[PDB]
Ligand binder design. Structure first.
Ligand SMILES: NC[C@H]1O[C@H](O[C@H]2[C@H](O)[C@@H](O[C@H]3O[C@H](CO)[C@@H](O)[C@H](N)[C@H]3O)[C@H](N)C[C@@H]2N)[C@H](O)[C@@H](O)[C@@H]1O
Ligand SMILES: NC[C@H]1O[C@H](O[C@H]2[C@H](O)[C@@H](O[C@H]3O[C@H](CO)[C@@H](O)[C@H](N)[C@H]3O)[C@H](N)C[C@@H]2N)[C@H](O)[C@@H](O)[C@@H]1O
Lengths: 275, 275
DNA sequence: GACCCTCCCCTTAGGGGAGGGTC
DNA sequence: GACCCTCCCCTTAGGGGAGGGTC
């Protein structure tokens, strides 16, 4: 015998007016009475029960046209719909959960770049392993290597990590080169950062890693004059301190920013392993 | 010296054409060259680097106008933005994680209702505790009690669980009543299903629970003729098997469906505790 | 005054599709 | 032929606000 205006319901049910009006329009929840002249909406007390579900499902995030299907459902049938919701949640849980490790690790790798002891000078250091995806570089050089050169590797990684490599890598044979002009990349690769499977990897992609070990490194900010010089510096450090190299030179390039409105700049790192 | 059409980039970067066009419109990522007559878009190989971030941030779910702010940021500053993302993730993780327990528990309570040994007959059984929110019922009766009668309790629960009670409860003193006409509810309550804090609960709300114990129950599907009868049945079962009651009668009403296009139906349960 | 009505413009990140024109 | 262009209509769950009228 008590009837509620939209305002009354709104306050009562902690749902907004514009919201009830909306739910009225999509015929998910309609007033018991619409005065035909004033088009005012009036609601019975016994209606409010229909909101409990709506409100819940909303909180869960069920889309509206979907609630409508849910309303009809009988107790046993609704139960199942819930466990559907349960499974859908576990997914998001996984998906984020994964992302959390990913980002913490992206961050961990960004740290070293800012904590690098000095630029332009060579030093040795003890390195954790880095897993990576590589492919034969088909006669590519520092000179003519392209971004596009990476696109297949980059599919795989994205399909795997979801989270595109900040980084670009290539390797080549440690030699007394005298010229950029003399150098060819053996493979080019990009680091993976998930231990998530890589479905349907084709066999022209080797999964391998930059082994744990001790490394003569040198790292600077790119510019053409320095590239070759710093390589030189490296070779020298080896030959002088008289060491035995046991890998290629690994070279990794990392943007310092992605502003398309500032001049491009990149951090380069050449490392190599020793006995 | 190699330039890419939108199609070329799209395939290269595994981003859609309509997507690059869009990113062009919002000046997040613009081609290096737009032919002035054909309005064809052309891109440099050295541009594709700007997509790695975009693509990542997208995967993380960063909104676009926000990526723009991120692009300018310097390595140290970007690092922080990430940990912002890290914290924002942990929230969702919590939020869902909570929901998962909630739903598993909503489900657990829905089960018993469908696994209830028989309807209309009384039996005793051993009950887990049920926490709940209640309030003095201010002389309310089975006769005149309303949905609205619950609205404050229901705020609290929603503010706490997010997930509106499927259920509605009231209690009253076990007596040889002869009439619905004789009955008053002592409190009316609604079960909580989170152990999450209930911020700024006002003191006219008692947090308490339906204690763990042994209970004479009876549960049926509502209709006016049966209500009082089944109560009667209950009283009788006690008096005959000669038992001592140690609580009020708890009464709980639960919709069987929320279809607003079928006749309303409800499951009632009256239980009481014994020594 | 305080509610309530309808109606209209607004948001995100594009996809689908038309009706051209181009490489 | 296969690319690419612009332009337009579409989606979700409403909120904000106008310009009335009503309880
Ligand atoms: N590793 C080659 C890389 O190409 C791009 O850019 C990096 C290159 O190394 C530079 O290219 C060359 O610059 C000069 C003339 O081109 C040469 O003297 C020099 N030896 C080369 O390094 C480029 N311009 C900037 C940045 N350093 C990408 O970031 C990455 O796809 C890829 O890994
Ligand atoms: N507990 C009272 C409850 O009111 C509503 O509905 C339930 C009531 O119990 C019924 O009300 C009464 O129906 C008859 C005439 O009104 C009476 O003879 C009977 N004794 C009463 O129970 C109602 N119509 C259906 C459903 N059972 C709500 O679900 C809930 O807010 C609240 O808990």
């Amino acid at each position: 015998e008590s009837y509620y205006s939209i305002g009354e319901v709104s306050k009562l049910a902690n749902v907004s007016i514009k919201a009830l009006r909306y739910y009225d329009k999509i015929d998910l929840f309609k007033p018991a009475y619409v005065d035909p002249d004033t088009s005012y909406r009036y609601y019975t007390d016994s209606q409010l029960i229909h909101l409990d579900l709506i409100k819940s499902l909303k909180y869960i995030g069920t889309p509206l046209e979907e609630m409508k299907k849910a309303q009809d459902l009988e107790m046993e049938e609704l139960f199942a719909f819930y466990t559907e919701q349960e499974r859908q949640i576990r997914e998001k849980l996984d998906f984020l959960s994964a992302l959390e490790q990913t980002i913490s690790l992206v961050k961990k790798r960004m740290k070293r770049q800012m904590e690098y002891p000095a630029l332009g000078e060579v030093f040795v250091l003890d390195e954790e392993e880095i897993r990576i995806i590589q492919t034969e570089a088909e006669g590519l050089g520092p000179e003519n290597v392209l971004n596009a050169s990476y696109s297949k590797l980059k599919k795989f990684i994205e399909s795997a990590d979801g989270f595109t490599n900040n980084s670009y890598g290539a390797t080549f044979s440690f030699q007394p080169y005298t010229s950029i002009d003399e150098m060819t990349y053996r493979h080019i690769f990009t680091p993976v950062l998930t231990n998530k499977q890589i479905s349907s990897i084709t066999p022209d992609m080797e999964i391998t890693t930059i082994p744990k070990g001790r490394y003569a490194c040198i790292a600077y900010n790119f510019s053409p004059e320095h590239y070759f010089l710093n390589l030189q510096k490296l070779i020298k450090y080896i030959a002088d301190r008289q060491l035995t190299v046991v890998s290629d030179v690994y070279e990794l390039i990392i943007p310092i920013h992605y502003s398309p409105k500032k001049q491009e700049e990149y951090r380069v790192e050449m490392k190599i392993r020793i006995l």
